[PDB]
Structure 1
Amino acid sequence: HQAISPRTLNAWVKVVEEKAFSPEVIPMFSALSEGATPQDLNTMLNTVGGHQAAMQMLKETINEEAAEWDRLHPVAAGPIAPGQMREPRGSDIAGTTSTLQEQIGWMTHNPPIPVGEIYKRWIILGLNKIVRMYS
């Protein structure tokens, strides 16, 4: 376990600086975000400055996806057994109501739940929505 690096972040920065919303941002986001936890995905997104309207389209996508997820995964009743974890919720996958450790556990369980890969798909749909508007 290590947080995405300042170094990888620089790159993502330089990419968005010039390729803000050409189709080439998408293949780059996907490489720079390999093995990313939700937290790291959000760290990437946060370094983006300005582009407020575009970010908001992306957020709207994330919010829609997360609600769909929840829909498709009703929580079972009963108290969570010891050494077990609650099934992630939309907001958990998006890193707004989950922790690192939690994120980390899921991506490892056998079989895992790769909350990082899931969130990253949502983000990509969001980036396709940006690209379609602007280019």
Structure 2
Amino acid sequence: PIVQNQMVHQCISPRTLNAWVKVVEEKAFSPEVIPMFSALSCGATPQDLNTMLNTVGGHQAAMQMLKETINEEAAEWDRLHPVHIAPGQMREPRGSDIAGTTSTLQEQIGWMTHNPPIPVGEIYKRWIILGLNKIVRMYSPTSILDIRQGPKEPFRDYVDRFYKTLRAETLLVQNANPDCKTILKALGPGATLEEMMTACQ
């Protein structure tokens, strides 16, 4: 990453490398893996972002889809900012430069700590997370329509499933079971989730 000591490059740590690999192995593309990726890639250069993605062993269908999303975003960067060199001067980053493909670490360090800074780490991380959210949604096994409360299912457990599915992807009342549904209609409109959950406790 780049961090303060002045902004300087620091090695990505064994802890960070390990953390990311393990979260992917344990959680796959569960929605909460996105904020974890983002946190572990704090201050990350494009080389670091590529390093973290490369260390993943499985899920190569997903990694391939991620490359496609990244390519799309790179072509849009080049559409918006066409790259136009003078000796010892900073060059303009194209799409592939931001994705760490055609840029060196020094060039990446140069853009990020420049004044004004060109945050190629954050621009790339945005493309990656955009791609990762597309995968999270695809790998979501259940539609929100299929999430309904079972006759003996505690209301809490049903809501946990409802917003879990919704995160990946008055309907809550519709899909509640008959008993709790009657209690919820009795509360009327403008009832908070807290009040609903207490009412069906």
Q: Tell me, in whole angstroms, the C-alpha distance in 1 between the residues paired with 2:70 and 2:27.
A: 21
The structure, 1 or 2, with the larger RCO (C-alpha pairs under 8 Å, 6+ apart) is 1
Q: CA deviation at 1:15?
A: 0.5
Q: CA deviation at 1:2?
A: 2.0
Structure 2: state its 5+ residue gaps.
1-8, 139-200
Q: Tell me, in whole angstroms, the C-alpha distance in 2 between the residues paired with 1:89 and 1:119.
A: 11
Q: Deviations over 1:8-37 (max 9, x none)?
A: 010001110121111001100110000000
Q: Tell me, in whole angstroms, the C-alpha distance in 1 between the residues paired with 2:87 and 2:102.
A: 20
Q: Tell me, in whole angstroms, the C-alpha distance in 2 between the residues paired with 1:74 and 1:43.
A: 27
Q: Tell me, in whole angstroms, the C-alpha distance in 2 between the residues paired with 1:84 and 1:104.
A: 14
Q: Tell me, in whole angstroms, the C-alpha distance in 2 between the residues paired with 1:43 and 1:6.
A: 12
Structure 1: state its 5+ residue gaps.
none
Secondary structure of 1:83's aligned partner: coil
TM-score, length of structure 1 as denominator length: 0.92
Pick from 105, 114, 125: which aligns with 2:119?
Answer: 114
Q: CA deviation at 1:52?
A: 1.1
Q: Tell me, in whole angstroms, the C-alpha distance in 2 between the residues paired with 1:56 and 1:33.
A: 20
TM-score, length of structure 2 as denominator length: 0.62
Q: Which moved more, 1:82-91 or 1:33-42?
A: 82-91
Q: CA deviation at 1:118?
A: 0.5
Secondary structure of 1:9's aligned partner: helix
Largest Rg, 1 or 2? 2
Q: Tell me, in whole angstroms, the C-alpha distance in 2 between the residues paired with 1:89 and 1:3.
A: 25
The root-mean-square deviation of aligned C-alpha atoms, in Å, is 2.6
Q: CA deviation at 1:57?
A: 0.9
